[PDB]
Amino acid sequence: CCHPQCGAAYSC
Amino acid sequence: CCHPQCGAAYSC
Amino acid sequence: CCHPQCGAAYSC
Amino acid sequence: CCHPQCGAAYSC
Amino acid sequence: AEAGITGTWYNQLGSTFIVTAGADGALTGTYESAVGNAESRYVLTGRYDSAPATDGSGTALGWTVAWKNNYRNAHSATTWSGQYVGGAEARINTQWLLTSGTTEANAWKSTLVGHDTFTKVKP
Amino acid sequence: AEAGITGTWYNQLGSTFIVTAGADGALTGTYESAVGNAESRYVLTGRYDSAPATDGSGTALGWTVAWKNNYRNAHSATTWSGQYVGGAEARINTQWLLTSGTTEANAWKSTLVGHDTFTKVKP
Amino acid sequence: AEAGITGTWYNQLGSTFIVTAGADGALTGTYESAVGNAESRYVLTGRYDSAPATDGSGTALGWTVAWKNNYRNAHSATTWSGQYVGGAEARINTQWLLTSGTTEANAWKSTLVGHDTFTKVKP
Amino acid sequence: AEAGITGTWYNQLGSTFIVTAGADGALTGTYESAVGNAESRYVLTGRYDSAPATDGSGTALGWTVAWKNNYRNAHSATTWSGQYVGGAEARINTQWLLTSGTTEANAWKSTLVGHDTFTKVKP
Secondary structure (H helix, E strand, O other): OOOHHHOOOOOO | OOOHHHOOOOOO | OOOHHHOOOOOO | OOOHHHOOOOOO | OHHHHOEEEEOOOOOEEEEEEOOOOEEEEEEEOOOOOHHHOEEEEEEEOOOOOOOOOOEEEEEEEEEEOOOOEEEEEEEEEEEEEOOOOOEEEEEEEEEEOOOOOOHHHOEEEEEEEEEOOOO | OHHHHOEEEEOOOOOEEEEEEOOOOEEEEEEEOOOOOHHHOEEEEEEEOOOOOOOOOOEEEEEEEEEEOOOOEEEEEEEEEEEEEOOOOOEEEEEEEEEEOOOHHHHHHOEEEEEEEEEOOOO | OHHHHOEEEEOOOOOEEEEEEOOOOEEEEEEEOOOOOHHHOEEEEEEEOOOOOOOOOOEEEEEEEEEEOOOOEEEEEEEEEEEEEOOOOOEEEEEEEEEEOOOHHHHHHOEEEEEEEEEOOOO | OHHHHOEEEEEOOOOEEEEEEOOOOEEEEEEEOOOOOHHHOEEEEEEEOOOOOOOOOOEEEEEEEEEEOOOOEEEEEEEEEEEEEOOOOOEEEEEEEEEEOOOHHHHHHOEEEEEEEEEOOOO
């Protein structure tokens, strides 16, 4: 998950 | 049309 | 339910 | 367009 | 996973999806209510990816049911689009579109959208 | 009226599809691109209301195309849901769902949605 | 381009979309019919990408209208999702979801789906 | 009732949103991840039926989140449309549309569709 919607608390 | 979305400006 | 999709066994 | 639907042409 | 898809499936509402997966990507079957009476049985036809990745990805597929049989006609049709996921708890996750035949005036409200999850055992 | 549906239809994106409407409610044919060469042709199957309302309403229908043929495989399937409307300028108005086979982590973003309008005359 | 979005827009059905784009990414306005009477006006609120890409892409946005004003209440709400495309023929291409309040038995059919294209001049 | 809606909601995927339901029909709040870091917080705005029916129907609503905050921009926006069902285990059942800003060429694949069910109990 890289999109904010799926809770992407990471930086791709 | 009986719903505001289709421009319902009448009385159904 | 009056539509075949929601499980209508017979027409309403 | 790299997908058959958007009238794609060849591979990708 | 032709073997995986072929068989009887049940959604959250109780409906029964009986399908056969052909070797060339064809889907054929019947869609009926939980009771199974003949008057609630409708023909279905669709397609599926007959050569999916074998790395754990799902198998894409879709099918259509026109709501008309020898006993009734609801002047509408529904298409299910989604993917088959095999394994201990196999499931077919879908989103669907239900379109009703309407006059030009009611066309804007002709289509309903929803989602169904089918499993091998009754919900 | 299978007479009205059977034939060649063109959409806005430049795609083409030739379909035959059986008297039994089945839709069969091929979906292709502009040029229409063996590489971009895909099998399509669906269903339609073979006995529509004669009150001016449209004819409900739907079909599926799994994007795999002898030359390519996009591991995905698209379903079109809509209605046929006859007349001097006949047309098939639809909405579609395109689902790709995905791993479980990406399942949430596996389905695209859009709309297509097909006519009997090239755009 | 709040300078692009702010203003009056019209869809293919004759409805009028009056909106103001805040520099913070907020959308505020009113949604009404052709007649434009107070009884046919409804509040709308939404959001938009206030710093779009400079690669020629559109500007993503979305807004909601609950169908209740001080005179009528349709117990439903619609959300439009799409993008603004500037230039000579500026427009907002959208797809929408109309959900109606329903009982559990009817929740399966609570949502309609469609698409609207908004332009700066009446169609 | 705004009281029933006001509060913290969680979805099946870990996301969390804190919303305040105004007496006028406004929804204002924040959508964020489980971790809850300031970098994962986005503003949300929407509307809801503030005077629902008393016939067992759910309460219609919808909201929008443009995916841009002070730390990131995904050039996209999502709209959720659905209804609030109160009671022992209250919940919000929704369907959403996620649109990304795209060039004209890729406009056909600009929107994803899905569904989310939110609850007041951390699942």
